[PDB]
Amino acid sequence: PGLPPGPLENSSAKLVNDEAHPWKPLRPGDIRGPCPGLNTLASHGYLPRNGVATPAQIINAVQEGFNFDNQAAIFATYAAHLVDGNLITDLLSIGRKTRLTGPDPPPPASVGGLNEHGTFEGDASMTRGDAFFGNNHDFNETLFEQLVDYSNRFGGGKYNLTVAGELRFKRIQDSIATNPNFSFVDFRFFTAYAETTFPANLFVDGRRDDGQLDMDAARSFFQFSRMPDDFFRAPSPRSVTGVEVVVQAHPMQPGRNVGKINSYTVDPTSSDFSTPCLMYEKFVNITVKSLYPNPTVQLRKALNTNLDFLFQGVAAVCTQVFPYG
Ligand code: HEM
Ligand SMILES: *[C@@H]1O[C@H](CO)[C@@H](O)[C@H](O)[C@H]1NC(C)=O
Ligand SMILES: *[C@@H]1O[C@H](CO)[C@@H](O)[C@H](O)[C@H]1NC(C)=O
Ligand SMILES: *[C@@H]1O[C@H](CO)[C@@H](O)[C@H](O)[C@H]1NC(C)=O
Ligand SMILES: [Mg+2]
């Protein structure tokens, strides 16, 4: 494993849809997944265009192409790699499971790519459906039209944090009413709120950086993995700034439906925004450990290295935990 890249030496706004990074359509076999950010980076060649990359490639791409901040890039990338990537080959698919990540570790590890439900990906996504409905990764036109509708009703036609606050809650209520397996606890509880800020913070041209995303740009990223022509990245590093506005609109407790629709039951063992270090500890002690309960020597070494890297991204002042000693 390579060391996590450091922050950008020069984090100014600049043209990122440039001659060295043209958009190209998918070739047969090219993988795209539930993340429009990574999808766009792959479709512009900031990441390998086949959608399989190393963690260091992913961190460099999100920083260079979008100005995602270093700590957020490290946390998200190593969390995804630990639960969805191949720790021996250092490869992660940004979408479906593929033999391109190499020989698989033993069960119960899945190495299922970012499409794997319940590890990183989860319910109440904005433009992707819940896994229970058949497809947790492809762009959904009905769901995007609802994002456009909420942008028209709360953002004057643009997506901003006010729209994020309303749409986030709508998608939660929709999942409670229709997905008997809806889960909204721990890691997904955090990412569901965080990801609603990214279109306002990172898909808005950095020469404006006004938090107002137009629907042409929104469709370009969410559906076609394509930067607008002449797109300038954000003018400074960021990730979740403004997530407080989304939470404040409709504060929620972590929980899940319990096998039936309209059965949302709070989980008092879940972490929440008052316990960010618990989210990290449960991710390592329960999610990662459940995939790798008794690893052999080479896997244990790779796990420990990637867990050290994950810890570098932990933003709360937290204590590191060591599931393999
Ligand atoms: C740094 C590494 C990253 C990783 C590992 C990652 C991974 C993911 C995954 C697995 C999802 C699916 C969560 C869900 O079920 O909705 C997701 C969603 C999302 N990501 Fe990323 N991502 C990263 C960076 C970024 C960046 C840099 C951007 C923007 C420039 C971005 C924008 C988004 C958005 C907007 C969503 C929500 C999609 C939706 O709900 O319709 N991500 N990401
Ligand atoms: C998209 O989402 C809508 C609304 O949840 C759902 O009815 C539909 O089956 C999904 N799939 C496609 C391919 O549109
Ligand atoms: C979103 O846009 C609406 C309409 O322009 C505005 O009232 C609201 O303050 C905006 N929210 C932001 C910028 O967070
Ligand atoms: C995680 O495991 C460590 C021991 O490795 C323990 O000290 C810590 O309390 C655990 N955290 C949880 C279960 O949240
Ligand atoms: Mg999802």
Query: Which atom in ligand 3 lies closest to the alpha carbon of residue 245?
Result: 14
Ligand-binding annotation for 35, yes or no, is yes
Please report whether residue 181 resides in a domain: yes
CATH of the domain at 232: 1.10.489.10
What single DSSP character describes residue 285?
A: I
Burial letters 130-151, b for 16+ CB under 10 A, else e: bbbeeebbbbbeebbebbbebb
Q: Is the dihedral of CA 197, 267, 115, 318 positive or negative?
A: positive
Domain span at 220: 36-312
Please report whether residue 13 resides in a domain: no
Nearest CA to 55 out of 276, 310, 287, 273 is that of 310
Tell me how far the alpha carbon of residue 207 lies from the centroid of ligand 1, in angstroms: 23
Mind spelling out the 3-state secondary structure of 96-153?
Answer: CCCHHHCCCCCCCCCCCCCCCECCCECCCCCCCCCHHHCCCCCCCHHHHHHHHHHHHH
State phi, psi for 93 to the nearest 5 degrees: -85, 135
Rounded Cα distance between 61 and 264, Å, is 38
Please report whether residue 26 resides in a domain: no
Q: Collapsing DSSP states into helix, strand and coil, what is residue 282?
A: helix
Q: Collapsing DSSP states into helix, strand and coil, what is residue 255?
A: strand
Rounded Cα distance between 199 and 164, Å, is 9
Query: Which atom in ligand 4 lies closest to the alpha carbon of residue 282?
Result: 14
Resolution in A: 1.4
Nearest CA to 92 out of 107, 103, 77 is that of 77
Asked if residues 239 and 198 have their Cβ atoms less than 8 Å apart, the reply is yes
Neighbours of ion ligand 5 (CB under 5 A): 121-122, 125
Residue type, 165: G
Look up tokens 């006004």; give the residue: 210
Please report whether residue 8 resides in a domain: no
Rounded Cα distance between 243 and 239, Å, is 9
Residue 169, Cβ neighbours under 10 Å: how many?
Answer: 17
* Number of domains making up the chain: 1
Residue type, 52: V
Nearest CA to 204 out of 241, 245, 154 is that of 241
Residue 56, Cβ neighbours under 10 Å: how many?
Answer: 16
Please report whether residue 125 resides in a domain: yes
Please report whether residue 256 resides in a domain: yes
Q: What angle do CA 283, 285, 287 make, to 5 degrees?
A: 45
Please report whether residue 319 resides in a domain: no
Nearest CA to 86 out of 51, 110, 50 is that of 110
- Polymer length of the chain: 325
Rounded Cα distance between 261 and 234, Å, is 40
Residue type, 245: V
Nearest CA to 272 out of 208, 180, 186 is that of 186
Residue 237, Cβ neighbours under 10 Å: how many?
Answer: 17
